[PDB]
Design a protein around this nucleic acid. Structure first.
Ligand SMILES: [Mg+2]
Ligand SMILES: [Mg+2]
Ligand SMILES: [Mg+2]
Ligand SMILES: [Mg+2]
Ligand SMILES: [Mg+2]
Ligand SMILES: [Mg+2]
Ligand SMILES: [Mg+2]
Ligand SMILES: [Mg+2]
Ligand SMILES: [Mg+2]
Ligand SMILES: [Mg+2]
Ligand SMILES: [Mg+2]
Ligand SMILES: [Mg+2]
Ligand SMILES: [Mg+2]
Ligand SMILES: [Mg+2]
Ligand SMILES: [Mg+2]
Ligand SMILES: [Mg+2]
Ligand SMILES: [Mg+2]
Ligand SMILES: [Mg+2]
Ligand SMILES: [Mg+2]
Ligand SMILES: [Mg+2]
Ligand SMILES: [Mg+2]
Ligand SMILES: [Mg+2]
Ligand SMILES: [Mg+2]
Ligand SMILES: [Zn+2]
Lengths: 222, 307, 153, 48, 115, 110
RNA sequence: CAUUGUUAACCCAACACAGGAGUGCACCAAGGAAAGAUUAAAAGAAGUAAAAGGAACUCGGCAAACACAAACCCCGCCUG
RNA sequence: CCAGCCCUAGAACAGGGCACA
């Protein structure tokens, strides 16, 4: 069976903006995708993006790295790539629908245990080093985007943020080696269990996704 | 006689309320369809463009914000203004309004009849149009007058132009001085007692009073503000959307008065544009779906690269 | 500034508000018609709608099961919720509850009180404010207008 | 594939008499689970 | 964003950047009118107890889109006459610096990596 | 801060008799066509609501007396019937409450 | 087979006061309710979080803080 | 015209909506 994959940018926000703006922006982003092939990728997959830089030797500039996070709504979708170059980690926030992008190539379609793995700033450099000249990995559709269960180490405290707080809900961090039982018990004082059973702060966009899927199919058949 | 209050739903029935809604809805639809072709019924004599002439504006609805990339690689931020319904309600003569320039009254989007008073409803009945939400006045010259009751389209402006935008900003209510005027507060914890956000001294000693121009906490946000010199990039004809560069004062889904830029640098730019307004019946030709500027990177682009 | 907000502050904070709404929803599910403060009932309306939507989702859905386990404090209501209220609401989409403002409480607080009630309950009907009969003057004139409009087509 | 329902026992942190009885049953089960008769008597007679 | 009292890291191979010291090289003053410096603004440093000039290569604050954001405030030593005292730069450098070649000619001539 | 002088009765009246502080007359008052009492146009009738509340209290008291346990809730639908009534085929299979009082006028059979 | 004390939600603080209270028992099998009902303006008190910087504010790193460390002077042996 | 219900409008008072769905 084939599972439908809707890109994160097509999901409109929770605000009360008029849907006509979202329709126009979806039409424009589909017309942009008609020329620029934006492939399928999730949080943690490794990509290579080609940008048009005027001040380089060649007009094209390649950058390969792991996707940190993707966020936005419509034509303003952004995704952050992380890569360690000669010991100095570098993060670049690319825009999906930018005209200066020449080519996007997913070299390893792979998910991870966390939807927003911003903790790579505090992780060890071994998990941010990636070979720029790596070869693209082709997988079969029946693999269903295998989720990589990789427990990541951590640099000593302090960290960039408080990844131990329940507001992040992170599983990809190996806490039993870096934090103590007292710290774990203290970090639970900021837990809000009622936000999971609130039943009202959720965003249900089933019919919205259905309409967007129908519109995308119509644009493809056009 | 202590007469009570009465609304339009109190005395109606379950079988009459939908009938009334439909009877007003199809009436408004028929009126907007009859007023859809103004150039064939009785248009006023179109005067030629003059160097010291001005043009009427529009009243649109601020939808939201979007990015827009230019061919040079730069990225600007545009705001979408939807021209839902722009109708010339009444025309006040120059001598009767200002003595220098004539005045045109423009109405915004359609609203319900069941919440307007008797005088406004009588005016709109004598005009033949449904009531409008926001009613604005535009000061134009005596040669760009239009007959009242004529609809206006977002094609009134062409890709590449400077305009002005007037609207009520986001009213933040009675706010403190630090948020209103930007006064700095006192230090947080070096001993200050009940003074973390106070404005401090408000005047001097020998004056024995405060001056009328003293900045103090008060109402903030709900006021008519105008931004000048906003460039328009893209004009959508199908949905009547205008892409105005920069920030537009006013919350989303609000009415916004658009007019030609009265800046001295763009005073004589109305020469190539349609002088009275955009008449779709005069040219007998349908404009493209999206009128792009000479620098806007269109959605269908070859992914330009530098050379 | 309080722009663009949907939840109102109640109790001693967020968790206290959640617990108060939980108790009110438990009482509503148990008695099928309750009365409280107008703001509390207006807030409880949406939570009750969502609870009915979750109850209609089936018994084996462990998500809805644990949701009802969290919300319904008295566990003798979850079988009731899944086998009385959810089955009787199948064709109805969002018309599950009815809220009406009652006169102010006779106590000295004089608070604005409302009553919420699940439709199709085994209780006497509330004195709902009904529309006027079609035999009224204005309704008869509108019926004449409707007949003329139908004869014109 | 099978309806999994929670037990119908009363709550534990409530003020009701059923909750008090449940707490009584809980400490009685604690006494039952106690291993030595010394600790059993200690828990049974710690109240004065 | 690099301002006063920021502990920066000298990248280019120089004596002042290689010899350890009992105090890290902190900032002195941003030559821009705003007290906040960005990528490509001349800065003053107090390295090993003496004054020197430097150029900001990269900072840890998220900047414009498609702009690299490093994990350390890397700066390269610069002389008063506009010449870098170092020999070569190993860490990557944002390609946006090559826009203004007139003022960063000799500083970028020793750069090996451009990102 | 301390007041400097005693405010005169003229200014006192001009302050505490302004229409902003006077109780405004509410003109949304109407009569209940059912029982003839008074009610507002957006609020239920107090008399009718009191009748419904008394009847609901009696019904709930009887349905709780039927269930000798606090956590013994009905697992099926419930139906209330009065003297002079028999459960029909559509009313069979549900929990039944029986009242000695006759069925009032406002309560519909349904 | 004498006489006396066997109640109580209590005493002292002008009060049904966020205060002062000796001893034996376990931290609940015993006591109570932070909210009169709304809206969520400013300022004020408290808490939580905050990108880049990490004391550049200030007499003073006062308070606060993912730390809760090492040293040098003045005065007083130290505990009190 | 402002009973009532909402608001990106608001301390109260004011202001804009409640016909397309
Ligand atoms: Mg506001
Ligand atoms: Mg400050
Ligand atoms: Mg002090
Ligand atoms: Mg003090
Ligand atoms: Mg303070
Ligand atoms: Mg004077
Ligand atoms: Mg020195
Ligand atoms: Mg006693
Ligand atoms: Mg209290
Ligand atoms: Mg209170
Ligand atoms: Mg309260
Ligand atoms: Mg405040
Ligand atoms: Mg604070
Ligand atoms: Mg903190
Ligand atoms: Mg900080
Ligand atoms: Mg930080
Ligand atoms: Mg200073
Ligand atoms: Mg200082
Ligand atoms: Mg301290
Ligand atoms: Mg310390
Ligand atoms: Mg320390
Ligand atoms: Mg001593
Ligand atoms: Mg009004
Ligand atoms: Zn009545």
């Amino acid at each position: 069976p084939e599972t439908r994959f809707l890109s994160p940018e097509f999901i409109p926000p929770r605000g009360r903006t008029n849907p006509l703006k979202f329709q126009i922006e979806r039409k424009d982003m589909l017309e942009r995708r008609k020329i620029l092939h934006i492939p399928e990728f999730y949080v943690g997959s490794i990509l290579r993006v080609t940008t048009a830089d005027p001040y380089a030797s060649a007009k094209t500039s390649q950058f390969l790295g792991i996707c940190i996070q993707r966020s936005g709504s419509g034509l303003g979708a952004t995704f952050i790539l992380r890569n360690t170059i000669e010991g100095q980690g570098v993060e670049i926030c690319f825009e999906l629908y930018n005209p200066r992008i020449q080519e996007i190539q997913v070299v390893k379609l792979e998910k991870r245990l966390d939807n927003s793995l911003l903790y790579l700033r505090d992780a060890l450099p071994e998990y941010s080093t990636f070979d720029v000249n790596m070869k693209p990995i082709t997988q079969e559709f029946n693999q269903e985007v295998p989720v990589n269960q990789l427990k990541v180490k951590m640099k000593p405290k302090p960290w960039s943020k408080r990844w131990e707080r329940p507001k992040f809900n992170i599983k990809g961090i190996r806490f039993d080696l870096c934090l103590t039982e007292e710290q774990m018990r203290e970090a639970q004082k900021w837990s809000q269990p009622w936000l999971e059973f609130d039943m009202m702060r959720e965003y249900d966009t089933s019919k919205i996704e259905a309409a967007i899927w129908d519109e995308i199919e119509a644009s493809k058949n056009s | 006689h202590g007469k009570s209050v009465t609304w339009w739903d109190e005395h109606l029935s379950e079988e009459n309320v939908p009938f009334v809604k439909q009877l007003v809805s199809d009436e408004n639809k028929a009126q907007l369809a009859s007023k859809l072709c103004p150039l064939k019924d009785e248009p006023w004599p179109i005067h030629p463009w003059e160097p010291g002439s001005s043009r009427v504006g529009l009243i649109a609805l601020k939808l939201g914000m979007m990015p827009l990339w230019t061919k040079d690689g730069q990225k600007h931020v545009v705001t979408l203004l939807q021209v839902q319904d722009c109708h010339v309600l009444k025309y006040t003569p120059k001598e009767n309004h200002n003595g220098r320039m004539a005045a045109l009254t423009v109405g915004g989007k359609t609203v319900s009849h069941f919440h307007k008073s008797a005088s406004i409803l009588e005016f709109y009945q004598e005009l033949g149009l449904p009531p409008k939400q926001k009613v604005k006045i535009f000061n134009v010259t005596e040669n760009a007058v239009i007959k009242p009751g004529t609809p206006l389209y977002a094609a009134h402006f062409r890709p590449g132009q400077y305009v002005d935008v007037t609207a009520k900003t986001i009213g933040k209510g009675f706010q403190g001085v630090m948020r209103r005027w930007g006064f700095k507060g006192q230090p947080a914890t070096h001993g200050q007692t009940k003074t973390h956000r106070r404005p401090g001294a408000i005047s001097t000693g020998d004056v024995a009073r405060v001056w009328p121009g003293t900045k103090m906490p008060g109402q903030l946000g709900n006021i008519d503000r105008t931004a000048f010199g906003l460039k328009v990039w893209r004009i959508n004809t199908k949905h009547n959307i205008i892409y105005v560069n920069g920030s537009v004062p006013g919350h989303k889904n609000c009415l916004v008065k658009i007019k030609d830029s009265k800046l001295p640098a763009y005073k004589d730019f109305c020469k190539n544009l349609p002088f009275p307004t955009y008449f779709p019946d005069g040219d007998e030709e349908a404009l493209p779906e999206d009128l792009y500027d000479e620098n806007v990177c269109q959605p269908g682009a070859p992914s330009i690269t530098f050379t | 500034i309080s722009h663009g907000r949907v939840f109102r502050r109640l109790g001693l904070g967020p968790e206290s508000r959640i617990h108060l709404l939980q108790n009110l929803l438990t009482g509503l599910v148990r008695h099928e018609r309750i009365e409280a403060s107008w703001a509390r009932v207006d807030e409880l309306r949406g939570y009750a709608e969502k609870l009915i939507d979750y109850g209609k989702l089936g018994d084996t859905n462990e998500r809805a099961m644990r949701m009802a386990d969290f919300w319904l404090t008295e566990k003798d209501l979850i079988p009731k919720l899944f086998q009385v209220l959810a089955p009787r609401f199948q064709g109805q989409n969002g018309g599950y509850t009815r809220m009406l403002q009652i006169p102010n409480r006779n106590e000295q607080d004089r608070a604005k009180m409302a009553v919420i009630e699940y439709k199709g309950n085994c209780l006497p009907p509330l004195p709902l404010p009904r529309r006027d009969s079609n035999l009224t003057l204005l309704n008869q004139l509108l019926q004449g207008l409707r007949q003329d409009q139908e004869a014109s087509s | 594939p099978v309806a999994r329902y929670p037990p119908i026992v009363a709550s534990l942190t409530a003020k009701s008499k059923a909750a008090r009885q449940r707490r009584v049953e809980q400490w009685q089960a604690t006494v039952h689970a106690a291993k030595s008769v010394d600790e059993k008597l200690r828990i049974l007679t710690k109240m004065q | 964003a690099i301002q006063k009292m920021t502990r920066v890291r000298v990248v280019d191979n120089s004596a002042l950047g290689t010899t350890p010291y009992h105090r890290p090289p902190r900032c002195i003053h941003v030559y821009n009118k705003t007290g906040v410096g960005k990528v490509g603004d001349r800065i003053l440093l107090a390295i090993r107890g003496q004054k020197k000039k430097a150029l900001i290569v990269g900072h840890r604050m998220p900047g414009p889109r498609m702009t690299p954001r490093f994990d350390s405030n890397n700066v390269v030593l610069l002389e008063d006459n506009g010449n870098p005292v170092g020999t070569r730069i190993k860490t990557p450098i944002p390609s946006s610096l090559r826009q203004r070649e007139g003022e960063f000619s000799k500083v970028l001539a020793i750069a090996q990596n451009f990102v | 801060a301390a007041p400097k002088n005693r405010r005169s009765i003229e200014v006192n009246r001009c302050r505490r008799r302004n229409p902003q502080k006077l109780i405004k007359v509410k003109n949304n008052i109407d009569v209940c066509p059912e029982c003839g009492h008074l009610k507002q146009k957006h609020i239920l009738c107090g008399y009718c609501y009191e009748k419904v509340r008394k009847e609901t209290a009696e019904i709930r008291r009887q349905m709780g007396k039927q269930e000798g346990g606090p956590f013994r809730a009905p697992t099926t639908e419930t139906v209330v019937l009065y003297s002079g009534e028999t459960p029909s085929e559509q009313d069979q299979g549900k929990r039944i409450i029986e009242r000695e009082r006759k069925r009032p006028s406002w309560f519909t059979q349904n």
